[PDB]
Amino acid sequence: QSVSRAAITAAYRRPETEAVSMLLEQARLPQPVAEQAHKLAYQLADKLRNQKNASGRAGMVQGLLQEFSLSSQEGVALMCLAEALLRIPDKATRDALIRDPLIRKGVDMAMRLMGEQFVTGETIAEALANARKLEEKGFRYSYDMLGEAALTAADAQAYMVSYQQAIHAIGKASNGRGIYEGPGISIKLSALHPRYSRAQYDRVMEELYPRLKSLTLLARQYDIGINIDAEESDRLEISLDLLEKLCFEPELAGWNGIGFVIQAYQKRCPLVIDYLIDLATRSRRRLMIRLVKGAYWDSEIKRAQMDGLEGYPVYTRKVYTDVSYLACAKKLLAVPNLIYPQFATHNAHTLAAIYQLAGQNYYPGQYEFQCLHGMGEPLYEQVTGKVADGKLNRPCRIYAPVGTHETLLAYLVRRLLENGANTSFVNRIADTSLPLDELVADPVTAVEKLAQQEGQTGLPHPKIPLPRD
Numbered sequence: 001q002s003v004s005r006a007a008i009t010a011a012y013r014r015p016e017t018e019a020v021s022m023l024l025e026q027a028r029l030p031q032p033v034a035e036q037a038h039k040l041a042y043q044l045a046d047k048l049r050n051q052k053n054a055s056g057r058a059g060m061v062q063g064l065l066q067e068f069s070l071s072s073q074e075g076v077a078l079m080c081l082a083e084a085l086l087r088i089p090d091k092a093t094r095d096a097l098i099r100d101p102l103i104r105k106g107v108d109m110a111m112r113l114m115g116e117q118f119v120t121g122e123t124i125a126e127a128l129a130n131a132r133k134l135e136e137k138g139f140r141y142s143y144d145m146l147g148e149a150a151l152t153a154a155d156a157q158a159y160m161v162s163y164q165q166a167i168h169a170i171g172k173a174s175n176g177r178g179i180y181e182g183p184g185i186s187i188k189l190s191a192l193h194p195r196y197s198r199a200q201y202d203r204v205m206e207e208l209y210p211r212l213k214s215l216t217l218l219a220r221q222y223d224i225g226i227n228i229d230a231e232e233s234d235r236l237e238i239s240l241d242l243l244e245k246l247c248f249e250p251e252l253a254g255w256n257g258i259g260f261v262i263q264a265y266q267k268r269c270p271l272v273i274d275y276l277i278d279l280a281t282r283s284r285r286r287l288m289i290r291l292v293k294g295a296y297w298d299s300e301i302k303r304a305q306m307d308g309l310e311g312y313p314v315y316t317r318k319v320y321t322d323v324s325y326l327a328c329a330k331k332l333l334a335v336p337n338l339i340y341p342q343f344a345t346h347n348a349h350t351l352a353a354i355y356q357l358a359g360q361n362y363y364p365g366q367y368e369f370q371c372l373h374g375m376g377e378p379l380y381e382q383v384t385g386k387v388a389d390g391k392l393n394r395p396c397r398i399y400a401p402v403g404t405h406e407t408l409l410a411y412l413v414r415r416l417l418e419n420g421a422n423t424s425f426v427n428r429i430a431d432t433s434l435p436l437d438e439l440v441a442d443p444v445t446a447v448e449k450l451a452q453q454e455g456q457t458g459l460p461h462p463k464i465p466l467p468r469d
């Protein structure tokens with residue numbers, strides 16, 4: 001193929017100067033909206049960073065090391081002494097005194113230790129029971145049965161039963177609350193078909209498609225959201241063929257519970273949106289669309305460098321992804337009859353920009369925010385909840401991984417890459433030396449700043465040359 005599908009294909013790996021140049025005026029926040037977004041972003045990031053006075057406290061340690069001149073060892077040493085001096089019960093005494101196999105096991109252990117913060121429960125019953133606390137406060141949940149990249153027919157069968165079981169449990173706990181207020185499920189197509197990574201069209205339709213359909217019908221019986229997670233870029237096209245067919249199932253007609261992730265770090269993203277708008281129209285439904293930046297960036301970069309093709313399917317500078325996300329968000333927000341946008345982010349500027357771009361006169365079913373468990377709750381503690389409690393009163397859906405240690409590894413590595421990259425907002429917020437204004441800097445303005453320095457808009461990362469170079 002159709003007009004929208006061909007345009008996707010044609011954008012696959014378009015040059016970055018071109019793709020970024022095209023997004024810029026779509027992502028640019030108008031004057032007033034920009035400043036209200038900056039203000040809100042600053043306030044969110046401030047409260048977040050300085051929750052327990054981290055910056056105030058940083059500036060005490062700095063101003064003591066500065067107006068007396070100690071190292072970060074001599075200053076620590078003095079606090080140890082000041083600490084003991086403040087265990088001396090009587091002030092008179094205090095003042096009088098002063099005046100006068102191994103590698104495999106470490107890897108597995110460090111994974112469990114680091115990973116636990118990202119997991120909501122070992123089983124679906126446990127995760128569901130831990131969900132009332134935040135659900136009272138106005139949070140929603142999407143449960144992710146951890147496990148992906150099924151290597152055998154047995155692996156895939158096991159994931160399929162774990163997903164079926166999960167939908168029963170989630171659905172019974174939902175109890176008719178529906179697709180917006182009630183819990184949903186997230187699935188990975190890679191879990192449902194053996195060797196998904198290289199699967200051919202015909203086998204996927206014959207074997208994957210009947211399983212996707214069956215889980216979706218079950219979700220529909222319970223009236224819960226069922227979201228298709230986005231994985232590696234070379235699976236985008238087959239995921240769209242599966243979505244298309246699923247949208248025209250007679251048993252799914254009139255039901256708006258189908259969810260689908262799109263990744264803004266891909267060049268194709270805006271063209272996928274045009275395709276999705278057309279699919280909701282032809283299939284007579286409102287699609288739930290999670291807009292994310294994307295989780296596989298390091299691997300996509302390595303992959304394209306080994307394939308030696310014309311270019312990258314993703315952007316090479318983080319700021320360009322940020323720009324693509326805002327442009328895609330505007331596109332999504334303009335067609336509320338056709339799409340329920342779910343704006344997944346832990347970035348305070350990102351959140352503030354969406355809040356402002358969504359316009360005045362919010363209504364619950366306009367959009368929601370989303371966040372990953374163990375990453376977003378502090379930001380969204382300021383967002384979800386009553387206005388009289390100082391909150392924005394916008395709903396947030398927490399993506400809740402559910403599993404034991406044996407399903408955790410791939411998810412955890414993605415989290416470590418996310419948390420540990422110097423470009424990540426969650427990494428920069430915890431840096432008290434980075435000024436709030438740079439942390440929440442507008443991406444479009446960031447890109448024009450580069451383009452004036454560098455001589456052109458949207459040049460690739462200087463350390464990430466084309467695969468052929």
Ligand SMILES: Cc1cc2nc3c(=O)[nH]c(=O)nc-3n(C[C@H](O)[C@H](O)[C@H](O)COP(=O)(O)OP(=O)(O)OC[C@H]3O[C@@H](n4cnc5c(N)ncnc54)[C@H](O)[C@@H]3O)c2cc1C
Binds near residue numbers: 294315345
């Ligand atoms: C609820 C939820 C569901 C999600 N589901 C999926 C999913 O199904 N599939 C998926 O792929 N991702 C998914 N993600 C997104 C991903 O897991 C990260 O959480 C997200 O990309 C971080 O974006 P941010 O706005 O929070 O952070 P920011 O720090 O503002 O942006 C972070 C990122 O920018 C991108 N990036 C990093 N470096 C570069 C670079 N040099 N050039 C271009 N881009 C760069 C990467 O996408 C990285 O995640 C999901 C996220 C959430 C919150």
